Write a protein that binds this ligand. Sequence first.
Ligand SMILES: Nc1ncnc2c1ncn2[C@@H]1O[C@@H]2CO[P@@](=O)(S)O[C@@H]3[C@H](F)[C@@H](CO[P@@](=O)(S)O[C@H]2[C@H]1F)C[C@H]3n1cnc2c(=O)[nH]cnc21
Ligand SMILES: Nc1ncnc2c1ncn2[C@@H]1O[C@@H]2CO[P@@](=O)(S)O[C@@H]3[C@H](F)[C@@H](CO[P@@](=O)(S)O[C@H]2[C@H]1F)C[C@H]3n1cnc2c(=O)[nH]cnc21
Lengths: 193, 193
Amino acid sequence: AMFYAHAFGGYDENLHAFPGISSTVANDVRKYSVVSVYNKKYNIVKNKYMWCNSQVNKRYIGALLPMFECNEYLQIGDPIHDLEGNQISIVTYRHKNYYALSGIGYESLDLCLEGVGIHHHVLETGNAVYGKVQHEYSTIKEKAKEMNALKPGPIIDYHVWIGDCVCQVTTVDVHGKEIMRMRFKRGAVLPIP
Amino acid sequence: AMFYAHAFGGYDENLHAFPGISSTVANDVRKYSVVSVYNKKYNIVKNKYMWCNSQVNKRYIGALLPMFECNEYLQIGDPIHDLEGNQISIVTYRHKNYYALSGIGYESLDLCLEGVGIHHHVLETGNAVYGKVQHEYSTIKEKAKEMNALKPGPIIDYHVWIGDCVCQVTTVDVHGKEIMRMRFKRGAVLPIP
Ligand SMILES: Nc1ncnc2c1ncn2[C@@H]1O[C@@H]2CO[P@@](=O)(S)O[C@@H]3[C@H](F)[C@@H](CO[P@@](=O)(S)O[C@H]2[C@H]1F)C[C@H]3n1cnc2c(=O)[nH]cnc21
Ligand SMILES: Nc1ncnc2c1ncn2[C@@H]1O[C@@H]2CO[P@@](=O)(S)O[C@@H]3[C@H](F)[C@@H](CO[P@@](=O)(S)O[C@H]2[C@H]1F)C[C@H]3n1cnc2c(=O)[nH]cnc21
C-alpha cells in the first residue's frame, strides 16, 4: 500500500483521491476506533469529525474525516497504522490535538473549481446561514427576506460551514443570493493551519 | 401544531418547510423509534431512510427522512403520532411498505430550481456515477476520461442518486460533464408514486 501526500506534490489523478492523499488503495477509515503512529496508540474521537480538503489542478477534494486525539506533534506524511500493523493512511491535517484520518470517510464534496471559488467557515453554535454569511437567526431571517425577490444567477462561490451540531454547504450568485444548500447531520471541526 | 400537505396546496412560505409538509413546528424526527397512525404502532427502520422531496414555487425541498414499516395502505395527510398522543407529522411519501416520517431529518438539499432541473435515480449497488449516468465502474471510468477534456459549462441539472449503501448528488452542464459530487454516507430508498 502506497500513500502520497498532496502537500508534497504527490497528487496523482489516476490514484484514489482523498483529502491530502493520493493512494493505491481505498481504505474505509470509518471502521477504526484506535490507530497507531510510530508505535503509539491514539483513540478515534466519537461523533465528531474533521472537514479536510486538498486543492490540486482546479480540483477540490473534501470530506468529513475521522480524527484521533494526540498531544504529540505529528507531521504531514507520518504513517498511520492499525493495531495489526498495516499502514492505512498518512498524517494530513490537524486541529490542535486532533489529527485527521484520511481515506474513505463520511460526507464528501468533489468540485471542479473552474470559474468558482470555495470558502470554509467555522459555524458558531446557534447561528443561521444565508449565502456567504452567518449571523443570529433574527439577522439572517431578514437578510433572507430581502434577498428573496432577487432573480437567482449562476453559482460563482461555494461556502462550507462546519459546526458542532451540523455542517452545511451553500452556493451564491454574484449578488450573494443563496442558490443551493446541503446539510450534513454531523458535528466537526476545521483544520487549523 | 398544524401540518399542511404540499400535495393539497398546503405550502406556506412563512412556515417550516419539510418534504411534503409545511408546519408551524420543527420536529426532530431522527429520535423516534416507534410511531402511531390511527392507534396502530409502527417501527422506524434502523439505518435506512427515504429520500423525499416536494417542489413548490420553483423551490426544491429534499431530505433523507426516517421511515416506518406498515402493511396497511396510508394516505397523504394521515396524522402521525408519537407514543404519548402528540402529533409529530403526517403521511407524505411511501415506498412499498415503507412510509416517510417528514420533519427535521438527516442530509437535506434545498435548491432554487430557476434555470435548472433535478432528477432522481435508484443507484444500483456496486455501480459508479459520473455526471448524469450510472454504470459499472470500468464503463464509468471510461466515460469520465472522454468527458475529461470537454470544457466545463454552466450547471443545468442536478441528479440525486439513492442507493442501499451510499447516496449522492451531482451537477452537470449541457454535455453531461460533472461539476460537483456530494456523497451522503447513508443508505436509503426513493418513494414509489
Ligand atoms: N425559526 C427559528 N427560530 C429560531 N431559531 C431558529 C429558527 N430556525 C433556525 N434557527 C436557528 O438557526 C440554526 C440553523 O438552523 P438550520 O436552518 S442551518 O437547520 C437546522 C439544523 F439542521 C437543526 C437544528 O440546528 P440548531 O437548532 S443547533 O440551529 C438552528 C437554530 F439555532 C435542524 C434544522 N432546521 C431547523 N429548522 C428547520 C426547518 O424549518 N427546515 C429544515 N431544517 C430545519
Ligand atoms: N477504483 C475502483 N475500483 C473498483 N470499483 C470502484 C472503484 N471506485 C469505485 N468503485 C465502485 O463504484 C461504487 C461507487 O463508488 P463511489 O465513487 S459513490 O465512492 C465509494 C462509496 F462512497 C463507498 C462504497 O461504495 P461501493 O464500494 S458499495 O461501490 C463503489 C464500487 F462498487 C466507497 C467510496 N469510495 C471508493 N473509492 C473511493 C475513492 O477513491 N474516493 C472516495 N470514495 C471512494
